[PDB]
């Protein structure tokens, strides 16, 4: 650190202690759906 | 009509109705119990109108007079199809298309019986034999297509 002498700030750069509050954060809830039928088939002569 | 080939009951079958045709064939088979295809008309009428066992009885009469007619077997197999005995229908369809090896509609009925039963490949041969007999029955070709798609062999379907 002494041989550094680059950014000493007397050990006391920013982020010095203080009376800080706390942040607040968000979130919600998702709903759901149900998919219906998708078939698409056809025949011609099913009777006898 | 009277004293002639009274195909008028056939005309009513084309109309799909029964009453006049039904009594007409009754009167036929006590005036011309000579043809049996008329009795087949009767069995057919009973078929669509859900007169099942009457169809069966008249078919059995058809079996008296000429047990060589594959089509009585065809109708018997149809009866079995809507009354469960599908295996007997299948062996009847053997019997029929042994009697008339170049008959188409028997192939169709037995293919329906097969797909009801669960053997696909036999039905494939049914349809294919139909086709090599007739390359023009496009409806049966589409039926082929539905079966093959049910087997997931997409591209050739």
Q: What is the DSSP string of A15-41?
A: ---------------------------
Question: Which DSSP helix (H) or strand (E) runs through B144?
Answer: helix B138-150
Half-sphere exposure at residue A14, Cβ-oriented, CA atoms within 13 angstroms = 0
Q: Measuring CA to CA, which residue among B92, B133, B128 is closest to residue B113?
A: B92
Q: Please name the residues between 1 and 48 in chain A that touch chain B, using a CB distance below 8 Å.
A: 41-46, 48
d(CA B111, CA B13): 25
d(CA B89, CA B97): 12
d(CA B104, CA B128): 11
d(CA B47, CA B78): 9
Resolution (A): 3.9
Q: Do A41 and B108 touch (CB under 8 A)?
A: no
Query: Experimental method for this entry?
Result: cryo-EM
Q: Specify whether the CB–CB gap between B117 and B86 falls below 8 A.
A: yes
Which among B109, B139, B146 has the least Cβ separation from residue A48?
A: B109
How many CB atoms within 10 Å of residue B41?
A: 22
d(CA B59, CA B79): 10
Q: Do A48 and B78 touch (CB under 8 A)?
A: yes
Q: DSSP labels for B64-114?
A: HH-TT-HHHHHHHHHHHHTTS-HHHHHHHHHHHHHHSTT-SHHHHHHHHHH
Q: Specify whether the CB–CB gap between B24 and B8 falls below 8 A.
A: yes
Q: Do B112 and A44 touch (CB under 8 A)?
A: no
Chain B residues inside the 8 Å CB shell of A40: none
Q: Do A45 and B81 touch (CB under 8 A)?
A: no
Which residue, chain included where needed, has tokens 């084309």?
Answer: B14
Which among B82, B143, B149 has the least Cβ separation from residue A45?
A: B143
Which residue, chain included where needed, has tokens 């008959």?
Answer: B103
d(CA B81, CA B97): 17
Closest approach of chain A CAs to the CA of B3, in angstroms? Answer: 33
């Amino acid at each position: 650190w002494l041989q550094e002498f680059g950014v000493p700030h007397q050990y006391s750069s920013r982020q010095v202690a203080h009376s800080g509050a706390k942040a607040s954060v968000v979130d919600g809830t998702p709903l759901v759906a149900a998919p219906s039928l998708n078939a698409t088939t056809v025949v011609t002569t099913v009777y006898q | 009509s009277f004293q002639g080939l009274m195909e008028l009951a056939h005309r009513e079958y084309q109309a799909g109705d029964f009453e006049a045709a039904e009594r007409h064939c009754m009167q036929l088979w006590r005036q011309e119990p000579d043809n049996t295809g008329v009795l087949l008309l009767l069995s057919s009428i009973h078929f669509e109108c859900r007169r099942l066992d009457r169809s069966a009885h008249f078919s059995t009469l058809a079996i008296k007079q000429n047990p060589l007619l594959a089509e009585a077997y065809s109708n018997l197999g149809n009866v079995y199809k809507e009354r469960g005995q599908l295996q007997e229908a299948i062996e009847h369809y053997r019997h029929a298309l042994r009697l008339k090896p170049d008959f188409i509609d028997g192939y169709i009925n037995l293919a329906a019986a097969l797909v009801a039963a669960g053997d696909m490949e036999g039905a494939v041969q049914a349809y294919v034999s139909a086709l090599q007999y007739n390359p023009d029955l496009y409806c049966v070709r589409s039926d082929l297509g539905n079966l093959l798609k049910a087997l997931g062999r997409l591209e050739e379907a």
